[PDB]
Design a protein around this ligand. Structure first.
Ligand code: O16
Ligand code: O16
Ligand code: GSH
Ligand code: GSH
Ligand code: MG
Lengths: 198, 198
């Protein structure tokens, strides 16, 4: 199939998709648009949002819906119907927290203030829940890597930018990040991808 | 399997699961708790959130992850992987919007302020996009009902409570709502379900 992923030049909400393509060794057009080119594109979209993934002429939207589609029938989806549910559940739990941040707030002072508050008063509870959930296991779900692990690594990479000590109390979550980063295909993408703040 | 759904005594985020169980004709325990029950309960939850679904003692969380789990391999899932992606996308677009509302904000007005903005400006645009997306088609995805249609009817029901004229200019979305409500198993549920504001 011919794939074309459209998003801004940043990891953001499209990174999970890029990790999946890398892991699966699938070629695709990583189309990164400049802010100025967004308006004319937005008007042609279903619900005016990106990322979107074009597959043989048809358009798909919603980052997680796309990610799930790409992992279907692969080892990244989950090893049992119930584990597949757990993968989806961990992914939404992580996405729910990421969606709490005022990424679009114009006023920098209020934005920064809210970021710091969420990272100091709210994040600790989620990190603990995740640590407890992971326990002494190697991966978040099952006994092999799933895209939920990829998502943890992607989300935490961004949160760590704003809160360096985020995982100082949870070395097990740090270990998981490193394990994902060590997967050859993932390590390679991480090394070659455009370096952007977000 | 023994199914036990735990949530507040309201439709909310659990209604989609309730609709699925009804449609598929699956018996389950519809456990509804009151606020005075939450505290002790929350302490016993993976990520302190409801709804949760217990399957033979095993706890599953995240409403959409659970909803997807129950509809896999059924006629509500989507007929192709691509269509399954569209179902997931439509559901997340709707969930994204519903999640924007400050349901928990404590101040009667600061809350009503964000609500007004969401209902007066954001809502109309989403309705337009959805209406355009549906076109003259019978259901949102494919040629048969899917849980995405279920979600549309559920989400729109709550939105209508705050903005009665939401669908005045989109009769096609109203027709879809009625189609879902006319499905025997669903109609029976809508008839017998506890009457709650949300
Ligand atoms: O409301 C917005 N308007 N315009 C935006 O560009 C924008 C960006 C935005 N961002 N989201 C994210 C990542 C989200 C995420 C969610 C789940 C998992 C992983 C990631 N990043 N991000 C932005 N970053 C930057 C950096 C520099 C300058 C501007 C931006 S936006 C959210 C909302 C909006
Ligand atoms: O912060 C909260 N804590 N506990 C809660 O139970 C809770 C519920 C809540 N609410 N969510 C919804 C509906 C969500 C929805 C999402 C997708 C599709 C359709 C629906 N309603 N809701 C509440 N409603 C009321 C009404 C009166 C008094 C209190 C509440 S909570 C939001 C936050 C929380
Ligand atoms: N939940 C959606 C979020 C879609 C979304 O809001 N995308 C933002 C960028 S991360 C966007 O399109 N912003 C431009 C706009 O809203 O005009 C997903 O994961 O795809
Ligand atoms: N995205 C989650 C939302 C989970 C959530 O926030 N649930 C609320 C009820 S609507 C809750 O448990 N609130 C109590 C709390 O957060 O302490 C889902 O759909 O399951
Ligand atoms: Mg979501």
């Amino acid at each position: 199939p011919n794939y074309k992923l459209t998003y801004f030049n940043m990891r953001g909400r499209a990174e999970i998709i890029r990790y999946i393509f890398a892991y699966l060794d699938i070629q695709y057009e990583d189309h990164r648009i400049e802010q100025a080119d967004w308006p004319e594109i937005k008007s042609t979209l279903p619900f005016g949002k990106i990322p979107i993934l074009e597959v043989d002429g048809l358009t798909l939207h919603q980052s997680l819906a796309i990610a799930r589609y790409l992992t279907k029938n692969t080892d990244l989806a989950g090893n049992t119907e119930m584990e597949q549910c757990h993968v989806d559940a961990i992914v939404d739990t992580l996405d729910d927290f990421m969606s709490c941040f005022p990424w679009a707030e114009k006023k920098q002072d209020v934005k920064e203030q809210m970021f710091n508050e969420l990272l100091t008063y709210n994040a600790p509870h989620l990190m603990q829940d995740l640590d407890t959930y992971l326990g002494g296991r190697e991966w978040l779900i099952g006994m092999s890597v799933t895209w939920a692990d990829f998502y943890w690594e992607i989300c935490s990479t961004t949160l760590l930018v704003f809160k360096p000590d985020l995982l100082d109390n949870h070395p097990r979550l740090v270990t998981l990040r490193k394990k994902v980063q060590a997967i050859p295909a993932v390590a390679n993408w991480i090394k070659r991808r455009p370096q952007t703040k977000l």
